Amino acid sequence: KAIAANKAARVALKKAAYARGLRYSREYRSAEKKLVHLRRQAKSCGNYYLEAKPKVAVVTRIRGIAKVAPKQRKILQLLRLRQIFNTVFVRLNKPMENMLRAVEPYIAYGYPSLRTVRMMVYKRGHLKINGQRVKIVNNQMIESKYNNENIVCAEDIVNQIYTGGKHFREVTNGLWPFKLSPPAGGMRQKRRHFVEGGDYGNRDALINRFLARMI
Amino acid sequence: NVEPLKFSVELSRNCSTKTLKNVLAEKKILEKYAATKSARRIAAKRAFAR
Amino acid sequence: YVYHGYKMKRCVRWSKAPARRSNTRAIWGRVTRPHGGSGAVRAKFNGSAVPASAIGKRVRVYLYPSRI
Amino acid sequence: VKKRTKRFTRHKCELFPQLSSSWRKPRGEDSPVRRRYKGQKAMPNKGYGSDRKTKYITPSGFKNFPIHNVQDLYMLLMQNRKYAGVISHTVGAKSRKAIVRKAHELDVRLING
Amino acid sequence: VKPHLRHYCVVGRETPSEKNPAPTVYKFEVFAPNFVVAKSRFWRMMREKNKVKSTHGDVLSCKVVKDRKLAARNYSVDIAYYSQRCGYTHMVKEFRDVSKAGAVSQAYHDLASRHRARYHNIEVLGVKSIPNHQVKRLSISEYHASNLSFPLLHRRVKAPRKDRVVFVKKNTKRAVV
Amino acid sequence: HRPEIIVVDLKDHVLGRAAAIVAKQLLLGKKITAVRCEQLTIAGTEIRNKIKYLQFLRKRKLSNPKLGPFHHRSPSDIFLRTVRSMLPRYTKRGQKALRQLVAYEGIPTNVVRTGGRVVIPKAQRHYCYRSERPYTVLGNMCKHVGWKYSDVVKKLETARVEKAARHHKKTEKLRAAWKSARKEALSKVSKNNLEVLKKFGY
Amino acid sequence: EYTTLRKSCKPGTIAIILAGRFRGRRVVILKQLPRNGPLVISGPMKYNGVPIRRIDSRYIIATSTKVDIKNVDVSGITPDIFVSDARAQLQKKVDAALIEAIRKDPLGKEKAGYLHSVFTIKPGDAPHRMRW
RNA sequence: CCAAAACCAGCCUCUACUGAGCAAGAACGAGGUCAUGGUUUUGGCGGAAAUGGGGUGCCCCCACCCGUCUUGAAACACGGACCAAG
RNA sequence: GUCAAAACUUAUGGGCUCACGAACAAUGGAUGACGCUCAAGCCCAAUUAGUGCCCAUUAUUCCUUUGGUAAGGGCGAGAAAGUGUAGCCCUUCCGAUGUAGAUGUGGCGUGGAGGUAAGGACGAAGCUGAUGGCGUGAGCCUCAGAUGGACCAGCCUCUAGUGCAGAUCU
RNA sequence: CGAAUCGCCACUUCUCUCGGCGCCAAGUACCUUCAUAUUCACAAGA
Numbered sequence A: 001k002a003i004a005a006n007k008a009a010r011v012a013l014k015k016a017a018y019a020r021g022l023r024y025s026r027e028y029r030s031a032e033k034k035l036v037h038l039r040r041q042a043k044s045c046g047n048y049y050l051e052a053k054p055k056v057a058v059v060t061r062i063r064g065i066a067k068v069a070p071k072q073r074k075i076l077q078l079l080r081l082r083q084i085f086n087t088v089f090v091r092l093n094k095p096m097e098n099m100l101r102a103v104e105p106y107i108a109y110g111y112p113s114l115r116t117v118r119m120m121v122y123k124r125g126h127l128k129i130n131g132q133r134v135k136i137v138n139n140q141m142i143e144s145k146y147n148n149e150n151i152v153c154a155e156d157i158v159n160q161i162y163t164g165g166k167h168f169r170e171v172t173n174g175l176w177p178f179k180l181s182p183p184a185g186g187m188r189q190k191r192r193h194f195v196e197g198g199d200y201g202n203r204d205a206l207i208n209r210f211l212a213r214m215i
Numbered sequence B: 001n002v003e004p005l006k007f008s009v010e011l012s013r014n015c016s017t018k019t020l021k022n023v024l025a026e027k028k029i030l031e032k033y034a035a036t037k038s039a040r041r042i043a044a045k046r047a048f049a050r
Numbered sequence C: 001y002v003y004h005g006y007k008m009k010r011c012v013r014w015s016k017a018p019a020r021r022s023n024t025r026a027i028w029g030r031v032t033r034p035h036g037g038s039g040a041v042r043a044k045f046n047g048s049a050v051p052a053s054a055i056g057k058r059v060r061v062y063l064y065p066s067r068i
Numbered sequence D: 001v002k003k004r005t006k007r008f009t010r011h012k013c014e015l016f017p018q019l020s021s022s023w024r025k026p027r028g029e030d031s032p033v034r035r036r037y038k039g040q041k042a043m044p045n046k047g048y049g050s051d052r053k054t055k056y057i058t059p060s061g062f063k064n065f066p067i068h069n070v071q072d073l074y075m076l077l078m079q080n081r082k083y084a085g086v087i088s089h090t091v092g093a094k095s096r097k098a099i100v101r102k103a104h105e106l107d108v109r110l111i112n113g
Numbered sequence E: 001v002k003p004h005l006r007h008y009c010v011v012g013r014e015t016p017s018e019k020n021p022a023p024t025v026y027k028f029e030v031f032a033p034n035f036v037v038a039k040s041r042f043w044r045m046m047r048e049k050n051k052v053k054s055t056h057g058d059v060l061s062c063k064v065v066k067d068r069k070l071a072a073r074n075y076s077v078d079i080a081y082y083s084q085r086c087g088y089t090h091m092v093k094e095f096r097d098v099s100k101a102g103a104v105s106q107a108y109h110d111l112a113s114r115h116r117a118r119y120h121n122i123e124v125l126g127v128k129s130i131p132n133h134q135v136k137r138l139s140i141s142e143y144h145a146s147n148l149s150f151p152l153l154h155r156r157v158k159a160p161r162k163d164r165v166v167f168v169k170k171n172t173k174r175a176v177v
Numbered sequence F: 001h002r003p004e005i006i007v008v009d010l011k012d013h014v015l016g017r018a019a020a021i022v023a024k025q026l027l028l029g030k031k032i033t034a035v036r037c038e039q040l041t042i043a044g045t046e047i048r049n050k051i052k053y054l055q056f057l058r059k060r061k062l063s064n065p066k067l068g069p070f071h072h073r074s075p076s077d078i079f080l081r082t083v084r085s086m087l088p089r090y091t092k093r094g095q096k097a098l099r100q101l102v103a104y105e106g107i108p109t110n111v112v113r114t115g116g117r118v119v120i121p122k123a124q125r126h127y128c129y130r131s132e133r134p135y136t137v138l139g140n141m142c143k144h145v146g147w148k149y150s151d152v153v154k155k156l157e158t159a160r161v162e163k164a165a166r167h168h169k170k171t172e173k174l175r176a177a178w179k180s181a182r183k184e185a186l187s188k189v190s191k192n193n194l195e196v197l198k199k200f201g202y
Numbered sequence G: 001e002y003t004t005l006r007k008s009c010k011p012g013t014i015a016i017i018l019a020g021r022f023r024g025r026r027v028v029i030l031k032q033l034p035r036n037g038p039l040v041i042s043g044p045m046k047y048n049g050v051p052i053r054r055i056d057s058r059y060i061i062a063t064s065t066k067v068d069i070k071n072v073d074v075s076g077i078t079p080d081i082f083v084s085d086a087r088a089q090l091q092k093k094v095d096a097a098l099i100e101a102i103r104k105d106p107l108g109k110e111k112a113g114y115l116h117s118v119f120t121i122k123p124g125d126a127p128h129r130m131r132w
Numbered sequence H: 001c002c003a004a005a006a007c008c009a010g011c012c013u014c015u016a017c018u019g020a021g022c023a024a025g026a027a028c029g030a031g032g033u034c035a036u037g038g039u040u041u042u043g044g045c046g047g048a049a050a051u052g053g054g055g056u057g058c059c060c061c062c063a064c065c066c067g068u069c070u071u072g073a074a075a076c077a078c079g080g081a082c083c084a085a086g
Numbered sequence I: 001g002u003c004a005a006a007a008c009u010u011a012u013g014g015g016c017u018c019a020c021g022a023a024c025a026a027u028g029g030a031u032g033a034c035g036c037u038c039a040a041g042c043c044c045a046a047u048u049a050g051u052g053c054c055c056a057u058u059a060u061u062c063c064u065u066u067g068g069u070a071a072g073g074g075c076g077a078g079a080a081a082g083u084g085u086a087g088c089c090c091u092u093c094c095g096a097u098g099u100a101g102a103u104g105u106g107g108c109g110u111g112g113a114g115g116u117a118a119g120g121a122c123g124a125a126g127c128u129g130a131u132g133g134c135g136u137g138a139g140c141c142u143c144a145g146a147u148g149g150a151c152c153a154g155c156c157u158c159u160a161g162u163g164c165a166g167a168u169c170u
Numbered sequence J: 001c002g003a004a005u006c007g008c009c010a011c012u013u014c015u016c017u018c019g020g021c022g023c024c025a026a027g028u029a030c031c032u033u034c035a036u037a038u039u040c041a042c043a044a045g046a
Ligand SMILES: [Mg+2]
Pocket: A187, A188, A189
C-alpha cells in the first residue's frame, strides 16, 4: 500500500520536476532574450543599458587555512569557507559585499553563469542532511531536505542560487559548502588581486572560467 | 617564422589583396615555385608523413 | 624492462617453449600518460616499481595494445 | 592485503644490542621520529589498522583458534570453514596424535597438524 | 603574438541620486588584458579624476573595440607613467604596428624594459594612428620607404618542433638523438 | 665488436650547452665520444675566460694542494670536468655516466673513420652567440693556461684533414659511379615505381 | 552476435600483427568471431606463412588498405574450430579464395607483394607519426 | 597462480551573443582507465609451481647521534663503550 | 639547460644588456654547482601563437583504518537489543598532527592470590631462532632446537616490591 | 655461459660555410617454404 504510494510520489515528483524545469528553461530563455532586446534597443537608440547588477556571487576560498587573522578567520567561517577550494554562493547584499571585501585576498569570486551554477549543483552539490554531507542524487533527496513546496527539483536549487531567489538562503544553506578541486591548469598567484595579474578578489564574470576548471 | 624565397613579384606596400590575386597570376610565381626541388622536397616530405 | 637474472626461472612458456628459457627476465608496464611537453611518458610497471638499475637502460615500449 | 608488512621497530634498536626491536613511542622534543621528519622511521597509528573483515585472517584464510585437547575440536565442528585450530605448543606429541586423527575425522582445519 | 592588451571602452557614471539626478556618463578607452581590469582602470580614473568611486558608480558598457583593419601602420602612443625614479613622465613614443591594441601593448613592453614600469604605473593618454610623415621619431621612419628591402641576416632557423633533434650527423640531417 | 657509441663532434659548440646536453644523454645511457674539444667555444673574449680559469686555478687546498681541486688544462679534461659538474657525480648513476663519455682533443685515429659524427644544433655557436659578440675558442684559451699539446693537436688535426681529403678524392671516381649508376637506375625497369618515386620526391 | 570491434578493423582489411609469433606480418582480417571475439586473421599462408588463426584486435594495426573479400566464404571459420587434415584443408579452401579476392582488385599485384611485406620498427622510425 | 582481451556500469580526459570577437553554450565522436564496480572469456605456470614472509647485496631515492634543560640542539652545551640483573 | 621532475634549451613574443646579471682584507670558493651571453641575465607578456609542463602530508576522488558522548536501517555461514572484544550486522557522513598535560582502552605485559578450564617425561618453565603467522601497537601464537629437564599457559576476579638505553645510576 | 643490448657500410666515416642501403624473392615478377608456437607475454630469433 505504502509501497506503491512511494511510486505515486516518485512519479508525481518528476512530473513536477519536468514542469518546474520546463518553466526555468523558459524563464531563462525568456529573461535573457528580454535582456538582449533592451541592450539592443538601446544601441539603436544611441543609448546605454545599465545591466541589472549581480545578485549572487560564487565566492571561493583560494588561500589555505594557515596564518589567517581573527577577523578574516571569522568571516570565512560565516561564509562557510573553512577549507581551501571550498565554494559557496552568497548573494551580494551591501552587508555581504562588506564581508567579501574583508577577506578578498582569501577568496576568488564573481558572478556565476547559469552553467556554472548547474555544474556545481549537479556535480559538486551536497545537501546537509541530519548533519550528514549528502551527495545529490535524487530529487527525492532534495524535497525531503527542503520541506518546501517551492524547492523540489535540483532545478529548484539552481534557480534559487542563480536568480537570487527568495529562498536563496533557504537553499544555499541546506547545501554543504562546495568542495571544489584546485583549478586545472593552475591559478595565477593566490597572493595578488585578479587585476594585478593574480587570483584573489572579485573577478566579475570571469569566475566562471576559473571555477569551471575546478568543478 | 618566415623563410624568404628566391621568388618575389614586384609590388607596392599595403597593396590590396585583389590586386595580388591579380599580379601573381600574371607571373604564376606560385605555380613556378612548386616546380623547384626546394618546393617538391617540402611536398615530398609532406606526402610521406601524410 | 627486459634484463636478466643469473639463473633461469619460470617464464611464460617454460614448458611449452624450452627454447625460451633464458636467465633473461622481463618487467612489464603500461605507458600511463605523457610526461612533460616532450616525448616522455609515465610508465607504471604493474603494481611494483621497476628497479632503479633499470635507469638509463633500454626499456622497450611495444606498439600494443594497438589503437590506430 | 596488508597496509604495512614491516614491524614498527623501536628507534635505534639496530645500534644497541640490548634494545628489543619491539616498539616504544619516541619521546624527547628532539626525537627525529616523533617529530616525524620524513627520512625517519614511522610510528604506529590507527591508520595502519588492517582492513577489518580480513583482519586476524591467516593466509590459509582461517582465523586461528587455540586448541589444547580433543574436546576443543568440537568448538570448531560447526565453524570449521571459519576457524582453524592451532594446537598449543605444549600439548604432548602423545595427545597431538589424538587431536590430529580426530581433527581429520571432523573436517576441522589445523594450523600445525 | 596577438596583442597583450585588448582594447576596451568602458562607459560608466556615478549612480543617480537626488544629489546628482542626471549624472554625466563617461566614456574611457583602456588597454587591458581583460574587461575586469579595464573596468578596474576605469574606476581608477573615476576617482582620480571625477571623485566618483566604484561603490557609487556603475559601468554601462565594458565592450571591447573592433580593430581598424590589419594593414601595417603607424601609431603615436601617448603614455604617462610613474616611478620613484620618475614620478610622472609624459612621453609620446611612436610605435609601428597593425592595431591600437598592438601599438599600446608594444608600448608597455617597451616601457617596462626601458623603465621598470608595471602596467598599473602606466596610463595611456591616447593612441592616434599617424600618417607616414608626422612621425618625428627616426627609428620607425626607416620603415616608411615604399622601397625598403632588408636581409634576414644570420637567422637561427629552429626546426618545426615535430622535427627537432638532439644529435645530427655533421654534414647531413640524419637524426641521431 | 663496438658498442653503440655516438661520437659527437664538438667543434664550434658552446661549452656549457654542449656540456649540458651531453651530460643529459649520458644519463639516458648514450655512450658519447666527444671530439675536437679543442674547438669548443665560450662566450666572451679569451681574456674574460682566461681570468675565469685563472680564478679557478687559484683555488687549491692550502693544507695540501696535492689533494686539492685539480685544474686539468686539456680542453677535453676541461670538458669532462664541465660535464661531470652537470651529472650526479657522487652517485654511481652519474659516476658511471661520466665514464661513458670519452673526450678527445682533435679527432683521434681510432675515432676517425669509425662512422659519421654527430652535432648538437642546440649547442652550435651560431645558434647561441650573437655572431658579432666576441667568443673564446676553448683550446685557444687553455693554451695560455698551461695545455702543452695545443700544437701537437693542430699538427695531428692537419694530418687527419690532409689525409681525409686525400681519401675524399681517392673515392671521387667511386662516389661518381654510384651517382651515375643511381641516376640511370631510374631509367631502368622501375616504371610504376618511377611514379611512386616522383611522389615523395625521389 | 555483438561486436565492439572498432571501425578501423573490418573484414578483408590488411592488418599488421604487433605481437605473437607473427610480428610485422601484414595479414588480411578474414572475419571476427561470432561474439565480440578475437579476429581470425589469415596470412594467407601462401604468402607470408601466417596460418588461419585468431588474433585479438588489440594486437594488430588495422591498415587502411583492404580487399573486398565479401566474396570469400570464411564461414568455415567458427569458434568451435579453435597440423590436422580438417584444418589444413580448411585454409587451402580459404586461402585460394582469399588469394583470388586479392587478385580481382586493381593494384592487386602490390597487395600480394604488400602482404609478403614484414613490418619492422627500424631505427629513427616513428609510427606515432605514421598514419597507415 | 600469472597474465591478456573483451562487456556493462562508473569515471575521466578529448548555440548564443556581440562587432571577425566574447564575459559564450552544448552536441557528435573517440580515448583512457579496475589502486573502481560488477560480467566471465582466453592463454601461461602447475616432484614442483605459485603468492606471501624472512635473509643478504645492490640500485635509485630519503635521511644531522640520541637523552636533556632551553626561545632555540646536529651543535664547538650537558649525559652517552658493551651487555645482563636491579 | 645539467645537476633535477618539467620549455628533449617552448614562443611562429617585446625591449634592454658586454661585465657584470639572476623576496624575506686577510685558510681556496661560491647566482647552490656547473655553466649561461640572439642567456640558462634583466623588465614585460605569453602557452603552442596574429589560427604549455613539473613537484606537496595541500585540494578533489577512491580504498582502508580509527574516532564521533555522529546519522540511519536491521536483528556455504552469520544474524548477539549491543559503550568497549575477533567490534551483532550493514549504510552514510564528518574528524584525524601535536610538547607539557588530561582522559579512554573486554588495551599489552609481569610476580602473586580466589575461581574456572586445561596442559606436561610422547618433554613444563627457561633459553635459541632468515619459525613463520596474527595484532596499528605494546605484544601474542605457532614451528624448530641435532635446547632443557619438571613444572605450567588460557580465561574472569583479586593483588603488587609489576614493564627501563640513559640517573658522572647500582 | 643462460644472459641485458636489436641497423648496417670504405655511396656517411673530408674539410669549410634526404649520405646510401636496409625493412621478406639479390626483386617488382609473388615464383614461393612457413600452421599445432595452437589470440600478448625477453625476438622461442640475431
Ligand atoms: Mg604560480
